Design a protein around this nucleic acid. Structure first.
Ligand SMILES: [Mn+2]
Ligand SMILES: [Mn+2]
Ligand SMILES: [Mn+2]
Ligand SMILES: [Mn+2]
Ligand code: NA
Ligand code: NA
Ligand code: NA
Length: 320
DNA sequence: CGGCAGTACTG
DNA sequence: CAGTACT
DNA sequence: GCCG
């Protein structure tokens, strides 16, 4: 990154807008930061700044202040609430609205939350694992977690296919959590497995807490056995084989990669989701779907790229 | 002016 | 529904 | 915040 001296201060504002709930302004900052991190050389003129997609007048002005003066004065006017709002919204299950409510009610520390806040079931689990959920794991540990889920699943049906997606499949050396996708080539055998699979993992002691238990998605907490182990976030999704390619693409990400791909599809009158790539999608002036369109056959990730007119990218090239 | 991805889950 | 979460 |  050629422009650390710029992006480092912009990311402070981005985080401030994000925890205060100004999601679209924060999105603009996030994109401009990526755009700056993707530029070969350091940026040296306001005209070069606008050069970059994702950099407008206001962002170019901010970059110039940074280069001429070495600082951005807006940083000196960030609300004193922001560190606390960040502290609170790092509780799993608490976002900007809950953080702002707790702040308005006078809470300033996790001790205040522990002792005085009403917590949802999810948030109480988030708080108990506050430190652990901010820690990443070595990818070798993600491998052990993936293999634990697969062994429990294959015990029920040898035909079940389990793959760790997210940062793991993109090849990262550390992982924030483990994202396991499960399907069955027979197109049927994936149905109703969650009850038995989660019970199998829970009877081990491996599954320690449940956050979300849906018919297709599980989000929870696990811990491998023995000393020196931390609690880790584990997500599981079970999908029909018909949707494997789009589910794999979704679950491998990155998030910004997915959003970019889905935006591209929309420009082409198509729609991309974890379920399917669809064509002839009908939308209104506001960009919302009014007519469903037709699911396109996508047996492989390659097929999704091809139908969108894009060259295939390995998971490691999706780490946007 | 107004979209900025599309979906699942909780209560 | 609003809120939060997933990539 | 940016951009069509
Ligand atoms: Mn992940
Ligand atoms: Mn995850
Ligand atoms: Mn722990
Ligand atoms: Mn993530
Ligand atoms: Na630009
Ligand atoms: Na949170
Ligand atoms: Na009090």
């Amino acid at each position: 990154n050629h422009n650390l001296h710029i992006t480092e201060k912009l990311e402070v504002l981005a985080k401030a807008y994000s925890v205060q709930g100004d999601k679209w302004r924060a999105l603009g900052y996030a994109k401009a930061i990526n755009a700056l991190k993707s530029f070969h050389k350091p940026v040296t003129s306001y005209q070069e700044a606008c050069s970059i997609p994702g950099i407008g007048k206001r962002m170019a002005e901010k970059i110039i202040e940074i280069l001429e003066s070495g600082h951005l004065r807006k940083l000196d006017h960030i609300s004193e609430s922001v560190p606390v709002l960040e502290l609170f919204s790092n509780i799993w299950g608490a976002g900007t609205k809950t953080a702002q409510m707790w702040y308005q009610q006078g809470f300033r520390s996790l001790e205040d939350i522990r002792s005085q806040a009403s917590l949802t079931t999810q948030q109480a689990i988030g708080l108990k694992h506050y430190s652990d959920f901010l820690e990443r794991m070595p990818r070798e540990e993600a491998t052990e977690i993936e293999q634990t889920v697969q062994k429990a699943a294959q015990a029920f049906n040898s035909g079940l296919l389990c793959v760790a997606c997210g940062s793991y499949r993109r090849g990262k050396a550390t992982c924030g959590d483990v994202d396991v996708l499960i399907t069955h080539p027979d197109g049927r055998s994936h149905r109703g497995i969650f009850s038995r699979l989660l019970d199998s993992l829970r009877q081990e002691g491996f599954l320690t807490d449940d956050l979300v238990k849906g018919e297709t998605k599980y989000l929870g907490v696990c811990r491998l056995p023995g000393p020196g182990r931390r609690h880790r976030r584990l997500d599981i999704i079970v999908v029909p084989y018909s949707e494997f390619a789009c589910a794999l693409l979704y679950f491998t990400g990155s998030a910004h990669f997915n959003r970019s791909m889905r935006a591209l599809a929309k420009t082409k009158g198509m729609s991309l989701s974890e379920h399917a790539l669809s064509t002839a999608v009908v939308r209104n002036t506001h960009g919302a779907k009014v007519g469903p369109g037709r699911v396109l056959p996508t047996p492989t990730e390659k097929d999704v790229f091809r139908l969108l007119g894009l060259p295939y990218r390995e998971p490691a090239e999706r780490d946007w």
